[PDB]
């Protein structure tokens, strides 16, 4: 009817139709608007706040209080209209047309009989509108009349838009009143999600456990820093409810992945078998065994779909009959009896049968962690699954097999890492803090310091860890701490402050952590680094909240901090540690603990004492014995096969042939390096020169064995 009503949209009609039904109470914020609308002078509040905190939902909640009458009667009966710029700026084609568009809008808003309070979505867009070459801005037209009280206006801008666009025109600011929308303070956000449950249960049809509602608050808010609180806490339930519809209306996820893969592996059988028999025989026979055994995993998977399908329907059968007969039979409680025989016969099974079916689900969720089949209930494991996917942990490691791989870590580490078993328990237990969820918030997991003499495998514990915890080399965010010899190289960590070159990118270390928040961070050599770099990390060990060029908080929760550094080259004794390590004694136990107590005292001198207490476990690696180095050399030959997979030359070695490799180049003062130099510069040459001259066909197995007579190594070729 009215001239502004076709511009934008009428917000009041959508409350009447129920599109905008309901808001949670932010009543101190809501009444502050109503008082600003009743002022004598300006009557134009602006909802300044963070982008996610629901600034429009106050106004979407304010219209619901107008039509339902929860306002004073001086504001009773006004209608609220939004103004999108998609409809507002369409008439700016001709030169004197947009001002006529502006003129009739003012002529309706100045009317008192026309009871309209106006709303705009973002005011900072409205400043740059209608700027023809002969015409003024739309905001400058409003400036003489927004000072006058008859034009009621409500608007909302974010803080970064308000400091850049409104403050550039300071005269446009004084027509408006700030009302600060505040972040909703997590303990109130739990009550917001509980208010919204019935709206999601109608749109999704999926039961939502209150366990997930707290998990949608504490896990969303404290662990993610951008996109302020209710844009996080509502978002995961928005993904939790969307996650289960696809597993119910479609198949569950495990069957969906395996059916696609077997169709792809069968396509690879068509590629390899048609080719000539060669080196690809080994991969073809690998894939045929992979094809059958994954296909046989299906037969128990469908069994699980049917059995949990029987568990789901049998719980669904009692929710239709006895759950409704429990509730509707509330009539005539007063005198026509509410507790006689048969009224409770069925109420008795409603605790027996329903809770037994409940415990079969809960035991199935902890067994099949995130991919439980035929489950109508949201759980914490579903909320953590979405958190773990969008945060960026790789798809096949340590969390998707929840609470099962944390026990197997210490067994798996030993093969990769034989020696120094005491420190590996601390690395295993730090992941046990991570996998259970029990840890200190805003404290990084596992701030280990790895002291020792060179070549005892201090960084090996870390290289193999990213392969083990994450199955990805890229998650090892190594930084070369030996680069930071200069005092002025500190800005490689946090980045360059504003007004200097390279501000648009952040710090080179911190830009990777935003990309990979679940990562095992290295610091290669704190021995050879300037003390000013230690001032900046000091932050990262006590808190995760290191700051950037833009002061964005970074999540160093769920980040294992391995710090290898030396502090040796004297002080670790040449005759009481290196040469005497072979003779297994309890005399180890007053010499290793003796030299360790000086090393923590050494950290008080070269590092700061603030590192001595914030580091969780200062591991000191024992120098290598013969029995450990006998298996470290055995590892190399296991790694030598990986370099020779492209040429299909399997390499094996006898234990007597390992010992001659040890006896020729055993130096504990270095440890594990000259043995590898003796492997890679001597034994590896005839692995090499016997290929150039044709002593090695591409399918030849090698078994190195010490002669123990003729004194020279023999090379067994088949």
């Amino acid at each position: 009817t009215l001239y502004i009503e076709q511009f934008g949209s009428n917000m009041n009609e959508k409350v009447r139709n129920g599109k905008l039904q309901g808001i949670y109470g932010r009543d101190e914020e809501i009444r502050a608007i109503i008082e600003s609308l009743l002022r004598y002078n300006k009557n134009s509040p602006v909802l300044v706040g963070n982008p996610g905190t629901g600034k429009t939902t106050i106004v979407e909640g304010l219209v619901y209080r107008i039509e339902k009458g929860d306002v004073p009667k001086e504001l009773q009966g006004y209608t609220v209209i939004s103004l999108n710029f998609r409809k507002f700026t369409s008439g700016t084609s001709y030169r004197g047309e947009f001002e006529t568009r502006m003129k009739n809008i003012i002529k309706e808003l100045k009317n008192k009989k026309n009871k309209i309070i106006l709303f705009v979505d973002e005011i900072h867009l409205l400043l740059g509108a209608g700027k023809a070459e002969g015409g003024t801005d739309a905001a400058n037209l409003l400036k003489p009349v927004l000072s006058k009280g008859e034009i009621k206006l409500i608007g909302a801008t974010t803080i970064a838009e308000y400091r850049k666009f409104i403050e550039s025109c300071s005269a446009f600011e004084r027509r408006f009143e700030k009302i600060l929308v505040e972040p909703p303070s997590v303990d109130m956000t739990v009550k917001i999600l509980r208010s919204l449950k019935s709206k999601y249960e109608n749109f999704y049809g999926i039961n939502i456990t209150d366990k997930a509602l707290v998990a949608a608050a504490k896990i969303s808010d404290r662990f993610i820093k951008d996109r302020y609180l209710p844009d996080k806490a509502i978002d995961l339930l928005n993904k939790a409810c969307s996650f289960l519809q696809v597993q119910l209306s479609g198949k569950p996820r495990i069957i969906d992945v395996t059916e696609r893969d077997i169709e792809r592996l069968s396509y690879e059988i068509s590629t390899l078998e048609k080719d000539v028999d060669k080196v690809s025989k080994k991969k073809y026979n690998k894939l045929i065994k992979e094809f059958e055994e994954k296909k046989e995993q299906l037969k128990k998977y469908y069994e699980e779909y049917v059995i949990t399908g029987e568990r789901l329907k049998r719980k669904k059968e009692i929710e239709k009959k006895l759950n409704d007969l429990k509730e509707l039979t509330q009539n005539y409680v007063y005198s026509n009896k509410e507790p006689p025989i048969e009224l409770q016969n069925s109420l008795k099974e409603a605790q027996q049968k329903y809770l037994e079916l409940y415990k079969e689900t809960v035991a199935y969720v902890e067994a099949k962690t995130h991919n439980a089949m035929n489950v109508d209930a949201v759980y914490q494991e579903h909320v953590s699954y979405i958190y773990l996917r969008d945060s960026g942990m790789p798809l096949g490691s340590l969390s998707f097999e929840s609470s099962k791989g944390a026990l197997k870590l210490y067994n798996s580490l030993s093969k990769s890492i034989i020696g120094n078993e005491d420190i590996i328990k601390s690395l295993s237990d730090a992941v046990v803090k991570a996998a259970t969820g029990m840890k200190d918030p805003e404290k990084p997991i596992g701030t280990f310091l790895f002291l020792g003499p060179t070549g005892v495998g201090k960084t090996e514990l870390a290289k193999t860890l990213a392969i083990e915890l994450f199955n990805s080399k890229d998650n090892l965010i190594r930084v070369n701490m030996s680069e930071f010899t200069e005092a002025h190289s500190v800005s490689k960590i946090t980045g360059s402050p504003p007004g200097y070159v390279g501000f648009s990118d952040s710090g080179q270390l911190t830009e990777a952590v935003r990309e990979k928040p679940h990562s095992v961070v290295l610091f290669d050599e704190l021995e050879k680094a300037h003390a000013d770099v230690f001032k900046v990390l000091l932050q990262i060990l006590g808190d995760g909240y290191i700051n950037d060029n833009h002061r964005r908080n970074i999540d160093f929760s769920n980040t294992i901090i391995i710090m290898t550094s030396n502090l040796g080259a004297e002080l670790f004794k040449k005759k009481l540690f290196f040469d005497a390590d072979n003779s297994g004694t309890p005399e180890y136990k007053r010499v290793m603990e003796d030299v360790r107590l000086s090393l923590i005292k050494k950290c008080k001198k070269v590092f700061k004492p603030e590192f001595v207490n914030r580091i969780d476990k200062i591991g000191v690696f024992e120098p290598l014995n013969k029995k450990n180095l006998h298996k470290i050399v055995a590892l190399r030959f296991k790694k030598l096969e990986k370099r020779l997979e492209e040429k299909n030359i399997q390499v094996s070695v006898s234990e007597k042939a390992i010992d001659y490799i040890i006896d020729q180049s055993y130096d504990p003062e270095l440890g594990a390096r000259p043995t590898l130099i003796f492997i890679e510069s001597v034994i590896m040459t005839k692995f090499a020169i016997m290929y150039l001259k044709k002593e090695l066909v591409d399918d030849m197995d090698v078994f190195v064995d010490y002669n123990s007579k003729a004194k020279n190594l023999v090379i067994n070729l088949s």
Partner: peptide
């Protein structure tokens, strides 16, 4: 001792 055996 290269032995092809």
């Amino acid at each position: 001792d290269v032995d092809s055996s």
